[PDB]
């Protein structure tokens, strides 16, 4: 047969990455994907799967595959896993307990940090309740943290809910930027995302 290559390079080798609060989702369909040239890459700091081994995935077909990409701190990548809590997992990106997929991350200090601070990567600091799995929140309403209510203005108990990381190349490895890619293997529709093993 003849098929397009799944555009994973557009996801992993992108020069620009989204903020975790506004995490970008790419829906991949009608293509062939070699999931072990990904796994067998020296690129990644993190490559854990919660469904089936990458070797087993080049056997199966899926109707849709999602590539969620964003940037967080090093010591925050542990939150991108089922049953984790923290500012990122609670307020920015939440995986379900029944997560079927893989979480991939690598250090991007050489590209996402600059002297003086890279303020373009943000994460949600405040929220009334936790996010549900795979929900996205791009709201920017003033969050009232104290007794006083604010009428849309930033106060001492009333914050802008987003927070810049301030990535610098001199930061510690835990405070350095890491790019994350979450692949979710959905099976609903025609299964047109497959591996090269059939």
């Amino acid at each position: 047969n003849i098929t397009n290559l799944c555009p994973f390079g557009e996801v992993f080798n992108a020069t620009r990455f989204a903020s975790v609060y506004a995490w970008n989702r790419k829906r991949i369909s009608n293509c062939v994907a070699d999931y072990s040239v990904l796994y067998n890459s020296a690129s990644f700091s993190t490559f854990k799967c919660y469904g089936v081994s990458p070797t087993k995935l080049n056997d199966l077909c899926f109707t849709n595959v999602y590539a969620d990409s964003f940037v967080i701190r090093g010591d925050e990548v542990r939150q991108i896993a089922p049953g984790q809590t923290g500012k990122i997992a609670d307020y920015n990106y939440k995986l379900p307990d029944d997560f079927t997929g893989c979480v991939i991350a690598w250090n991007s200090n050489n590209l996402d940090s600059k002297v003086g601070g890279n303020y373009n990567y943000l994460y949600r600091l405040f929220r009334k309740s936790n996010l549900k799995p795979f929900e996205r929140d791009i709201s920017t309403e003033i969050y009232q943290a104290g007794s006083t209510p604010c009428n849309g203005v930033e106060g001492f108990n009333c914050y802008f809910p987003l927070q810049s990381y301030g990535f610098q190349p001199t930061n510690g490895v835990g405070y350095q930027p890491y790019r994350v890619v979450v692949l979710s293997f959905e099976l609903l529709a025609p299964a047109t995302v497959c591996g090269p093993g059939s």
Partner: nanobody, 130 residues
């Protein structure tokens, strides 16, 4: 990485005053915010003051407003907190903390949210007693 060295504080009678200093060393950001927090016995740590790296955008809890003034040295990376008309309820350990400013849609925000602060000082004791 930046480090914060607190200085000042100690024991004072009701009605007295104090001045806390916090020296900021290391690779500072172009735009950041310095916050003063305090933790009293039997209570959670509370924010007291917040100031920009410029010296402006000062905010205070309504419990020290009018009595405390945060400021910045104009030739040094040291941030001051002048505390006037001290009362026994002001007795606490005072902490200096640094955080990055938030840049969004072409606008800077200088906040000092407790859970967001990136660097903390060791803290200094402040006792207001008779």
């Amino acid at each position: 990485q930046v480090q914060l060295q607190e200085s000042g504080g100690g024991l004072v009678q009701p009605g007295g005053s104090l001045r806390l200093s916090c020296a900021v060393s290391g690779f500072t950001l172009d735009y950041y915010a310095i916050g003063w927090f305090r933790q009293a016995p039997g209570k959670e740590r509370e924010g007291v003051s917040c100031i920009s790296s410029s010296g402006g955008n000062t905010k205070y809890a309504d419990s020290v407003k009018g009595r405390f003034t945060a400021s910045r040295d104009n030739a040094k990376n040291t941030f001051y907190l002048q505390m006037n008309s001290l009362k026994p309820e002001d007795t606490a350990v005072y902490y200096c903390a640094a955080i990055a400013a938030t840049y969004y849609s072409g606008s800077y925000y200088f906040q000092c949210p407790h859970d967001g602060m990136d660097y903390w000082g060791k803290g200094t004791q402040v006792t207001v007693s008779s």
